[PDB]
Each structure stands twice: as structure tokens, then as C-alpha cells.
Target: Eukaryotic peptide chain release factor subunit 1
Amino acid sequence: MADDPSAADRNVEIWKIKKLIKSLEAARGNGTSMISLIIPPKDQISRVAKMLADEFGTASNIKSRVNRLSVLGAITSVQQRLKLYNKVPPNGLVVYCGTIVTEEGKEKKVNIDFEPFKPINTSLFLCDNKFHTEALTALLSD
Model:
């Protein structure tokens, strides 16, 4: 709000990313493809979707349906995910996805895309088990 400085709305965002990431790397799905794509604010979403496209053609060409199936879930999640924004802030754009699993024997996909900490000209595209970014590990490590 206007009553508080920019650090207010900032501390919050950085809190949600540093809060989930922490508890995220601690517990993740036993078997799921976590998508992680980070890009600087020096780009346009339009180009983003394009990439998400070629992806489908990749996991699809695979012989194991487990490729087109899994990616199909995340690919379709992130796709429409970004579309819910269109234009990201000057802080850049970093999409995150990951399906967790409950001890009771449940599973859920909680993917959230939003500008990272600061407008870093860095980047990283690769689906792993946990969000791999020098940013989250930067503030966390300190």
C-alpha cells in the first residue's frame, strides 16, 4: 500500500518465494517432472509460450507415454499460467512448477509463476526435482 514503502510489497513477494522454495526443496513429489524456467525482464512473454510449444513435441515424440503425459500436465499448466499475466514487471519473469506428495498417499501440483527477486540478466531452463536458482540460494544462504 501507499502507507508503506516499496520494501513492503517486496518483502512479501520475496517471502513467498523464499518460503515455498525452502519447504519445497525439503519435500517434493516421489515421481514428477518439475519445470523451472527463469528469464530476465529483457524479453517478451510471446517468446516464452513459443518455447513451451516445442516442449510438447519433445515429450510427445518419446516412445514412453510417460513423457508426453507428464509434460502434458505441466506444459498445459504453465502455458495458461503465464497467459494469466501477459506482461510481467521489470523484475523479470520466472515460472515454477512442482507436484508434491502427502505421506497419507496424495499428490498435488502447485505451480506459481511470478517475477523473481531482482532483475537479473541470468537464466536457467531445465526440469529438475527442486527449483535450481542462484537467487533463491543467494538470499537463503545468507
Notes: The helical segments are 6-26, 45-61, 65-83, 134-141. The chain has four helices and six strands.
